[PDB]
């Protein structure tokens, strides 16, 4: 029941700096982009209905 280890994993996690990327769209433009990605073309599909974040 020792409290000696309290920030063990967060303390020992190798710090990685977030990259620099161009800003995401906001408001109506982001919704337009989502609608375009999901309803305009069938390029990102396979007939198997894969997921948006498929790492395979």
């Amino acid at each position: 029941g020792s409290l000696a280890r309290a920030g063990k994993v967060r303390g020992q996690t190798p710090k990685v700096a977030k990259q620099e990327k161009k800003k995401k769209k906001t408001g109506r433009a982001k919704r337009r982009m989502q609608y375009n990605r999901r309803f305009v073309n069938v390029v990102p599909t396979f007939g198997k209905k894969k997921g948006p974040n498929a790492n395979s």
């Binding site: 029941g1 020792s2 409290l3 309290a6 920030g7 063990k8 994993v9 967060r10 303390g11």
Partner: protein, 141 residues
């Protein structure tokens, strides 16, 4: 069966009113013993002073030491055990500092592994634990 008569309104209402007392939620919310035994006194949050840091052992299926703090509430001097949610967040707490403590989300019930702990620390030294956790704010000096 139940009474179905044009003049049975009094009997039906009385039966409903007596039988409501056999509902645990109704009896809890309409007796006053639960309100008087509630450490917060019916409030949503309460400020207290940390008396010590404790490590509560998780329930039997799991194995961990949940970092909590014994805090004495300013409103009534009652001693409670408040969970310090995130990791390394017990390091942000020092002895005899003021912490704002909320419920654990289950309305007087223990939550998850932590046995008998129904409160969690929300603020320490007038700074939220989440602001200290993400580096947004630093402990007052």
């Amino acid at each position: 069966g139940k009474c179905r008569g044009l003049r049975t309104a009094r009997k039906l209402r009385s039966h409903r009113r007596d039988q409501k007392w056999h509902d645990k939620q109704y009896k809890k919310a309409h007796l006053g013993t639960a309100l008087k035994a509630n450490p917060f006194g019916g409030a949503s949050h309460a400020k207290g002073i940390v008396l010590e840091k404790v490590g509560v052992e998780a329930k039997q299926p799991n194995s961990a030491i949940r970092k909590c703090v014994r805090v004495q509430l300013i409103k009534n001097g009652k001693k409670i055990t408040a969970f310090v949610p995130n990791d390394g967040c017990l390091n942000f707490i020092e002895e005899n500092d003021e912490v704002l403590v909320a419920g654990f989300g289950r309305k007087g019930h223990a939550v998850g592994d932590i046995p008998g702990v129904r409160f969690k620390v929300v603020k320490v030294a007038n700074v939220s634990l989440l602001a200290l956790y993400k580096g947004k704010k630093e402990r007052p000096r």
